Design a protein around this nucleic acid. Structure first.
Ligand code: K
Ligand code: K
Ligand code: K
Length: 149
RNA sequence: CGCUCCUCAGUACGAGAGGAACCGGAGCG
């Protein structure tokens, strides 16, 4: 499919704060999460890595929080995250950068860190069940939000 | 001792969405 993500970017090809409308191919996003390692950010970029989605390692939900209205089960099922993330029983949401040109992220180069952009593909652990494509509202930082489609 | 860079380490430690230090290396005061 294809997800529409809205984001405010300071179009360096201008400088000003512009309201871009990015379109992502669900197919390509999934491809991304597959070519991506199945670990909890112990890579140079730090991706992919756990997306708490408002939760804690227990499955209990953090104060003043509200999970992403994902839809499909699993994705909305309180996670279970244990330290290395590699809990022989754990199950949680991972996040990885995804881009409109749906190229695979250089997950291992810190210094210099390939800019991860505003969007990420969220998929289950350890089955990589695509959940959705969320993105920051302003720039490539801040609070994540589930885009439309 | 102070500052820049590497490294430590995307580690430790986090979960307001991130993220140190000590040791060590290069340099300036
Ligand atoms: K971690
Ligand atoms: K340092
Ligand atoms: K040092």
């Amino acid at each position: 499919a294809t997800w529409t993500c809205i984001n405010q970017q300071l179009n360096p090809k201008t400088n000003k704060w512009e309201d871009k409308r990015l379109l992502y191919s669900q197919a390509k996003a999934e491809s991304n999460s597959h070519h991506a390692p199945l670990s909890d950010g112990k890579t140079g970029s730090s991706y992919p890595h756990w997306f708490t989605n408002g939760y804690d390692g227990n499955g209990k939900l953090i104060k003043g929080r509200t999970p992403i209205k994902f839809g499909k089960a699993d994705c909305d099922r309180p996670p279970k995250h244990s330290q290395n993330g590699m809990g022989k029983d754990d199950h949680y949401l991972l996040e990885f950068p995804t881009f409109p040109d749906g190229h695979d992220y250089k997950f291992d180069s810190k210094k210099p860190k390939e800019d991860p952009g505003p969007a990420r593909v969220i998929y289950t652990y350890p089955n990589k069940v695509f959940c959705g494509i969320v993105a920051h509202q302003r720039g490539n930082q801040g609070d994540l939000r589930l885009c439309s489609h």
